[PDB]
Design an enzyme around this catalytic site. Structure first.
Site, PDB file in Angstrom:
ATOM      1  N   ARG A  21     -19.727  10.188-111.045  1.00  0.00           N
ATOM      2  CA  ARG A  21     -18.848  11.258-110.614  1.00  0.00           C
ATOM      3  C   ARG A  21     -19.321  12.633-111.015  1.00  0.00           C
ATOM      4  O   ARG A  21     -19.876  13.306-110.152  1.00  0.00           O
ATOM      5  CB  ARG A  21     -17.441  11.098-111.152  1.00  0.00           C
ATOM      6  CG  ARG A  21     -16.660  10.150-110.274  1.00  0.00           C
ATOM      7  CD  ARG A  21     -15.220  10.128-110.718  1.00  0.00           C
ATOM      8  NE  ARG A  21     -14.457  11.080-109.942  1.00  0.00           N
ATOM      9  CZ  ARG A  21     -13.150  11.251-110.130  1.00  0.00           C
ATOM     10  NH1 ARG A  21     -12.475  10.559-111.045  1.00  0.00           N
ATOM     11  NH2 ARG A  21     -12.516  12.150-109.384  1.00  0.00           N
ATOM     12  N   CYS A 156      -8.765   5.557-121.095  1.00  0.00           N
ATOM     13  CA  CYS A 156      -9.968   4.771-120.832  1.00  0.00           C
ATOM     14  C   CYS A 156      -9.656   3.401-121.432  1.00  0.00           C
ATOM     15  O   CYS A 156     -10.008   2.370-120.840  1.00  0.00           O
ATOM     16  CB  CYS A 156     -11.243   5.352-121.501  1.00  0.00           C
ATOM     17  SG  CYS A 156     -11.826   6.955-120.873  1.00  0.00           S
ATOM     18  N   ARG A 176     -11.978   0.957-119.381  1.00  0.00           N
ATOM     19  CA  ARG A 176     -12.448   1.304-118.062  1.00  0.00           C
ATOM     20  C   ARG A 176     -13.859   1.865-118.041  1.00  0.00           C
ATOM     21  O   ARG A 176     -14.685   1.410-117.235  1.00  0.00           O
ATOM     22  CB  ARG A 176     -11.517   2.326-117.463  1.00  0.00           C
ATOM     23  CG  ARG A 176     -11.678   2.446-115.978  1.00  0.00           C
ATOM     24  CD  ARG A 176     -10.867   3.607-115.514  1.00  0.00           C
ATOM     25  NE  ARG A 176     -11.260   4.888-116.059  1.00  0.00           N
ATOM     26  CZ  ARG A 176     -10.339   5.608-116.683  1.00  0.00           C
ATOM     27  NH1 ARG A 176      -9.085   5.160-116.813  1.00  0.00           N
ATOM     28  NH2 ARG A 176     -10.662   6.789-117.176  1.00  0.00           N
ATOM     29  N   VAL A 178     -16.938   3.446-120.884  1.00  0.00           N
ATOM     30  CA  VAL A 178     -17.208   3.714-122.278  1.00  0.00           C
ATOM     31  C   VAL A 178     -18.473   4.498-122.425  1.00  0.00           C
ATOM     32  O   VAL A 178     -19.418   4.314-121.658  1.00  0.00           O
ATOM     33  CB  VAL A 178     -17.436   2.488-123.148  1.00  0.00           C
ATOM     34  CG1 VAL A 178     -16.506   2.762-124.323  1.00  0.00           C
ATOM     35  CG2 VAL A 178     -17.221   1.134-122.469  1.00  0.00           C
ATOM     36  N   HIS A 217     -21.735   2.772-120.269  1.00  0.00           N
ATOM     37  CA  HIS A 217     -22.765   3.657-119.853  1.00  0.00           C
ATOM     38  C   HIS A 217     -23.312   4.464-121.021  1.00  0.00           C
ATOM     39  O   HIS A 217     -22.599   4.716-122.010  1.00  0.00           O
ATOM     40  CB  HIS A 217     -22.132   4.497-118.752  1.00  0.00           C
ATOM     41  CG  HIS A 217     -20.927   5.404-119.042  1.00  0.00           C
ATOM     42  ND1 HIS A 217     -20.645   6.262-120.028  1.00  0.00           N
ATOM     43  CD2 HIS A 217     -19.881   5.494-118.161  1.00  0.00           C
ATOM     44  CE1 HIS A 217     -19.505   6.858-119.776  1.00  0.00           C
ATOM     45  NE2 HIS A 217     -19.062   6.376-118.648  1.00  0.00           N
ATOM     46  N   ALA A 285     -17.915  16.136-124.121  1.00  0.00           N
ATOM     47  CA  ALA A 285     -16.506  15.771-124.030  1.00  0.00           C
ATOM     48  C   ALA A 285     -15.989  14.798-122.955  1.00  0.00           C
ATOM     49  O   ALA A 285     -16.146  15.008-121.740  1.00  0.00           O
ATOM     50  CB  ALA A 285     -15.692  17.064-123.924  1.00  0.00           C
TER      51      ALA A 285
END
Lengths: 286, 286
Positions: A21, A156, A176, A178, A217, A285
């Site tokens: 994204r 998350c 969801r 990491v 990731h 962040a």
């Protein structure tokens, strides 16, 4: 501990060095799981002096049903105003970008723990453990489809199941996305402490910690510094002790047991002759 | 396929031959995960002529937002009245025990897919894939804490994440309790078909199938018949073909694509030169 060193390497061979994204590039693998025996020590992997005090303060705040950032300031910093904190530059743009002011993050984790549709799911999931222990429904979902719309950052870490062994408590989260580089460390510790606190209420021996992953990731941000965490053998691991909780504690009614919990600021949680390693820097962040 | 044979054996060494809720004994292990490449064939492991037609009919019904059992009868059986079905002796006691009559199961899976708090989460999760593909929030929770109270059976399969590769779609479910003996087979197939149907709408190549487990259990019911599924090498696996969907299909708007989906009764889904094995019997209701 062993299995963390492994995963990192196995994300390399994953294949998908991919766009995403808010793109750049990432090497990432969808579908991970690990298991930790807290019996054989406290798994929170150090290196970088883990800002653990702020990890401990987010968890308690989470458990208070709050959603106002200054409250978190009070728990960490004994001050409603002075002291940065983990959600600050997160409120200062994502949350303020919804219209919120001086305090609110929107219906964040804490509220879905304490109030999902009026179900106070912390207080009542500690009763199923207390009462039907070998039940399977002892779950607390934080993803609220219908209220995603008002949150700063949709959770998350969104789900978790507890299992009762014959005297151990086990917890398993689903996350969801990491950031193994700089995320997954703060998360191993948060639920490790949560299976401690709930095993002390239920008076069970903290058992195993399992983690289910979605998009695990590593960011393409000059990995040679993350690389360094390879090849080492952990030897002397951390003892895991909480304080300030009054001797009557394990008999107190569930609702009276969190009341006392919430009274503990982060000084009350501490580790014995815990592995040193130095602190370098560099962050991004989430 | 390979990894199913393994898990079963590894539950044996698990340790916990244990008491549970509607007790007897079980050997069970908390925390499993497996991964399937649908590219290398359709993973639905046969033996017992898998009552797959009723697995296909539950999934479509699920996708229709229904919760009335006779509707499921219509999809499987082209008949609102004649023909048993998978939720019958489940409605006839758990659901009727809440007060329901001739039809309702209460706010079951289908409704939480199509209506969780007014979020129609099937129709809109197929848009994120269509539109922000490498997004991470493309999740559909079925556990609704606040509506557990009105359901026949709270969902055993409650969550799932989709991931987009570079041309593959991946799905991962989390299941609270699984009966590997006679459950987990009907579930491998249901989401295997769901990553097919959604890859045909999104026009992606169906990719990998991952499963996260909570209480994976085998019941203590004279295991020598389950044992038999050990030691064999699958060789010729099933082709995976859906029919009746009109050529325009992959360009149709998401909302118009399910409309057509729902028009397919279970005859429309079929497998080529799919491994035979005989059907024995013996079951216990979940």
């Amino acid at each position: 501990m062993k299995q963390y060193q492994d995963l990192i390497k196995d994300i390399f061979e994953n294949g998908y060095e991919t766009d995403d994204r808010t793109g750049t590039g990432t090497i990432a693998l969808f579908g991970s799981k690990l298991r930790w025996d807290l019996t054989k020590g406290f798994p929170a992997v150090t290196t970088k002096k883990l800002a653990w005090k702020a990890c401990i303060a987010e968890l308690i705040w989470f458990l208070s049903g709050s959603t106002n950032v200054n409250d978190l300031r009070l728990i960490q910093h004994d001050s409603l105003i002075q002291g940065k904190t983990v959600w600050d530059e997160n409120y200062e743009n994502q949350a303020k970008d919804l219209g919120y002011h001086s305090g609110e993050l929107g219906p964040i984790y804490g509220k879905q723990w304490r109030d999902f549709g009026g179900v106070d799911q912390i207080i009542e999931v500690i009763d199923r453990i207390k009462k039907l222990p070998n039940d399977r429904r002892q779950i607390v979902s934080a993803w609220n489809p219908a209220e995603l719309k008002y949150m700063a950052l949709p959770p998350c870490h969104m789900f978790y199941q507890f299992n009762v062994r014959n005297g151990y408590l086990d917890l398993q989260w689903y996350q969801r996305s990491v950031d193994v580089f700089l995320g997954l460390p703060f998360n191993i510790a948060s639920y490790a402490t949560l299976v401690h606190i709930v095993a002390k209420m239920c008076n069970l021996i903290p058992g195993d910690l399992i983690f289910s992953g979605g998009n695990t990731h590593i960011y393409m941000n000059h990995v040679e510094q993350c690389k360094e965490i390879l090849r080492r053998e952990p030897k002397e691991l951390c003892e895991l002790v909480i304080s300030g909780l009054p001797y009557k504690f394990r008999y107190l009614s569930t609702k009276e047991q969190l009341k006392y919990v919430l009274k503990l600021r982060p000084k009350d949680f501490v580790l014995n002759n815990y592995v040193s390693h130095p602190p370098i820097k560099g962050k991004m962040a989430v």
